[PDB]
Amino acid sequence: AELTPILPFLFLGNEQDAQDLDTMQRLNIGYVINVTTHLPLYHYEKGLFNYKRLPATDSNKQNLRQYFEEAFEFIEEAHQCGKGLLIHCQAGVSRSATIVIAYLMKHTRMTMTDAYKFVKGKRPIISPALNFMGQLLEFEEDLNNGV
Numbered sequence: 001a002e003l004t005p006i007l008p009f010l011f012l013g014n015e016q017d018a019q020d021l022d023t024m025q026r027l028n029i030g031y032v033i034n035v036t037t038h039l040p041l042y043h044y045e046k047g048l049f050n051y052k053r054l055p056a057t058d059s060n061k062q063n064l065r066q067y068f069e070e071a072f073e074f075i076e077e078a079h080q081c082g083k084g085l086l087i088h089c090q091a092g093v094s095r096s097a098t099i100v101i102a103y104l105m106k107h108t109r110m111t112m113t114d115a116y117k118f119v120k121g122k123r124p125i126i127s128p129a130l131n132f133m134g135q136l137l138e139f140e141e142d143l144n145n146g147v
């Protein structure tokens with residue numbers, strides 16, 4: 001089990017990490033973002049967390065930018081209510097790390113590169129995806145130009 005803490009209230013993991021109900025509970029997690037389409041929402045039957053599925057695939061054509069602000073609003077719900085969010089996808093953490101970096105660019109004032117470094121220092125293995133890097137570049141331009 002390896003639930004990396006990015007911020008005190010924001011956690012990053014893969015499929016295997018999201019199946020530990022005992023560690024999720026120890027970290028005061030009450031929100032879960034599942035950035036896959038086929039995986040189950042783990043522990044939905046226990047009525048312990050609030051969930052959100054961003055239905056995405058690890059494809060070169062997948063748009064994750066459409067989901068950014070739907071996520072940012074679910075993250076800020078947790079930030080305010082005093083609970084933790086787990087954004088998880090699959091082994092490479094390509095999709096979930098993309099959203100994590102995006103939030104750190106809009107709500108922390110970081111640049112894309114500083115965000116990537118911040119996140120790689122805590123979870124050292126984030127496998128690459130050129131499709132998502134391009135979307136972050138566009139997002140960085142949109143924020144500096146007030147959009």
Ligand SMILES: CSc1scc2c1-c1nc(SCC(=O)C(C)(C)C)ncc1CC2
Nearest residue numbers: 094097098113116126127128129132133
């Ligand atoms: C937006 S990434 C970025 S910004 C500056 C650099 C990089 C980078 N990223 C990656 S892996 C991509 C990731 O982590 C996901 C996109 C899947 C979240 N390999 C190499 C580099 C070179 C240096």
